[PDB]
């Protein structure tokens, strides 16, 4: 078990991450760093030893069944995902912590919301995609609730989020509601209601078919 799930820090701050193992056997614990699109890079081995090439700002230690990885002072390349790992002699299998993400702290920013009706193009093709855009918001946590003629939608939508923007460090999210065309054609009001920290009360964008 790793935690916290996310660590919002600024560059120059100290990052402390936790990992609870099966045993306290110091020697069976390791830490990895992984950035999007790249293979894992070993940081710490044997719970307290720094691997080849890993800078001094990375440190580790174990207290009982809780291993801590410390980043004395976060540099810009340190914002990635960290996993702890474990494996002993026999049986040989390795187990991985589920990961902790070191995120760039920024000021709160409410998302500007946009709702997009299915285009006439796709409707002539047989489907209907209703899209909900939540632009440049912070922090990451945001809840989108889809609405059709007042009916709460569940299980018919999918969303995806962008990586933290390199210039402003915010997030953008897109939620697509899939309805069959005839279904779409028999209801009137479509709305994405958004809940976010920067919003004092929920905001909903909507349109009439």
């Amino acid at each position: 078990t790793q935690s916290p799930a996310t660590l919002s820090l600024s560059p120059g701050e100290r990052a402390t991450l936790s990992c609870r193992a099966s045993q306290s056997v110091t020697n069976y614990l390791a830490w990895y760093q992984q950035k999007p699109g790249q293979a894992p890079r070993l940081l710490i081995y044997g719970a307290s030893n720094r691997a080849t090439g890993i800078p001094a700002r990375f440190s580790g230690s174990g207290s009982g069944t809780d291993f801590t990885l410390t980043i004395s002072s976060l540099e810009p390349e340190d914002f990635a995902v960290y996993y702890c790992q474990q494996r002993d002699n026999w049986p040989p299998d390795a187990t991985f912590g589920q990961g902790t993400k070191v995120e760039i702290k920024r000021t709160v920013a409410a998302p500007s919301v946009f709702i997009f009706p299915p285009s006439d193009e796709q409707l002539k093709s047989g489907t209907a995609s209703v899209v909900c855009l939540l632009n440049n918001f912070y922090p990451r946590e945001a809840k989108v609730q889809w609405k059709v003629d007042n009916a709460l939608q569940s299980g018919n939508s999918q969303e995806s989020v962008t990586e933290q923007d390199s210039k402003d460090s915010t997030y953008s999210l897109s939620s697509t509601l899939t309805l069959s065309k005839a279904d779409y054609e028999k209801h009137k009001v479509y709305a994405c209601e958004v809940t976010h920290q920067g919003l004092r009360s929920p905001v909903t964008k909507s349109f009439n078919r």
């Binding site: 070993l42 081995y45 049986p91 990961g99 796709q122 632009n135």
Partner: protein, 203 residues
């Protein structure tokens, strides 16, 4: 010290794939080797290991009886035969080296190779338009396999652009949206190489 993987590919369920990971820079026969997979949006997941001398293997529950790990020390290559592939096996598979000063850790890794398992067939996408501060975009829908690229005005427009990660729909087809906020003309240039689909879409 190096490891190069190969063998990843788009496959239908029930088919087989063989992954390779050739090693250079330390002598292969001295260390044990493993395969670690990483599903899309998930964490590192251990798969299997093979002993230094190649005689004792071990597997994760989810692949036993189906994948078999092995190695040819002579030609410094580790292998992962993957049979009876299922849709939930799709992930990036990395081969990894047991550490030299502690081999309970993995000190080196291959660059990884993609294994995609789907009962879907190659298909080009339909690009539909999404229409003081305005937002517009292009919905790149129903394509397979990954990936697709999206640019605006042939690479000239770049500020305010957010191209979202593809999402796998129930149909087994991918779908992705690409937006741009503006405070003229807008064209999303979409390229789906697996199917030779180049589509410019003026919004």
């Amino acid at each position: 010290i190096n490891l190069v993987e190969s063998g990843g590919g788009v496959v239908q369920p029930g088919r087989s794939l063989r992954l390779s990971c050739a090693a250079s820079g330390f002598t292969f026969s001295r260390y044990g080797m493993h395969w670690v997979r990483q599903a899309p949006g998930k964490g590192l997941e251990w798969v299997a290991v093979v002993s230094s001398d190649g005689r004792t293997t071990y597997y994760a529950d989810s692949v036993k009886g189906r994948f078999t790990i092995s190695r040819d020390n002579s030609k410094n290559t580790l292998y992962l035969q993957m049979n009876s592939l299922r849709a939930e096996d799709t992930a990036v598979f990395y081969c990894a080296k047991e550490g030299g000063d502690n081999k309970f850790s993995f000190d080196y890794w291959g660059q990884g190779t993609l294994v995609t398992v789907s009962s879907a067939s190659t298909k080009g996408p339909s690009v539909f338009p999404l229409a003081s501060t305005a937002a517009l975009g292009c919905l790149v829908k129903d394509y397979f396999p990954e990936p697709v690229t999206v640019s605006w005005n042939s690479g000239a427009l770049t500020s305010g652009v957010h191209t979202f990660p593809a999402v796998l729909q129930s149909s087994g087809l991918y779908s992705l949206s690409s937006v741009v906020t503006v405070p003229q003309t807008y064209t999303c240039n979409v390229d789906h190489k697996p199917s030779n689909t180049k589509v410019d879409k003026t919004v």
